From a paper:
To examine the structural effect of other amino acid substitutions at this site, the crystal structures of seven variants (D76E-, D76A-, D76S-, D76G-, D76Q-, D76Y-, and D76K-β2m) were determined at high resolution (1.15 to 1.52 Å). Comparison of the crystal structures of D76E-, D76A-, D76S-, D76G-, D76Q-, D76Y-, and D76K-β2m with those of WT- and D76N-β2m revealed no substantial differences that could explain their different stabilities and aggregation propensities (RMSD < 0.6 Å over all heavy atoms). For D76N-β2m, the network of hydrogen bonds involving the sidechains of N42, T73, and Y78 found in the CD and EF loops of WT-β2m is maintained in the variant. Together, these observations indicate that the sidechain chemistry at residue 76 plays a role in protein stability and aggregation, but the behavior of the variants cannot be rationalized by their crystal structures alone.
Here, we report the use of the TPBLA to explore the role of the protein sequence in determining the aggregation of the naturally amyloidogenic protein, β2m. β2m is 99 residues in length (10.8 kDa) and has a seven-stranded β-sandwich immunoglobulin fold that is stabilized by a single disulphide bond linking Cys25 and Cys80 (31, 32). The protein forms the noncovalently bound light chain of the major histocompatibility complex class 1 (MHC 1) and is important for antigen presentation. Another example is β2m, in which aggregation of the wild-type (WT) protein is associated with the deposition of amyloid fibrils in the joints of patients undergoing long-term renal dialysis (dialysis-related amyloidosis [DRA]). More recently, two single-point variants of this protein, D76N and V27M, have been identified in amyloid deposits in the viscera or tongue, respectively, with the former occurring in the absence of kidney disease.
Residue numbers in the entry: 0 to 99
The structure:
Amino acid sequence: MIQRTPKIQVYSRHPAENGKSNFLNCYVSGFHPSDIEVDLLKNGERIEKVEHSDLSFSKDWSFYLLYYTEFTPTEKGEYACRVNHVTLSQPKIVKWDRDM
């Protein structure tokens, strides 16, 4: 058996084909087992519509999830990614930094 804690990165990207649009991303990487719960939050509230959830695995059966959706950040509000995993004794909340 192996278990590996997910690394969690929260960042924003503009797709080059539509640069005015902006996407909030939570990249959850290197985890095992694959069982997981991942949400994007706005002001602590689950964002129910997340357009993209792309899961894959590597040769060593570590899993990778990109969880992302279109958003429009202003100076208002707090955005985050919340992850629950067996390796994590409490849910891990990683806030989005507007400079990322």
